[PDB]
């Protein structure tokens, strides 16, 4: 039962650092994508 | 907005939704379990004392 538990917070715990990185990449895609769909609308303009 | 990641969301989700229900039932057998003995040691000494 005391194996059992820790089988859980395992479980938990490898769960929070994925959804935490998932999060990371997104954010990083997002400015990414932000900073270069603003630069090719410049050069438009330029 | 990749397809893949929001897929591997809802896997961390799950796991996580999961994990948590897990250790909700082991508390509650973990309850039951310090009943069962409260029992079990109430009535051996009820035996110790008819005797």
């Given at each position: ?29 997002k ?16």
């Amino acid at each position: 039962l005391d194996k059992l538990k820790e089988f859980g917070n395992t479980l938990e715990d490898k769960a929070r650092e994925l959804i935490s990185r998932i999060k990371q990449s997104e954010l990083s895609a997002k400015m990414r994508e932000w900073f270069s769909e603003t630069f090719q609308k410049v050069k438009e303009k330029l």
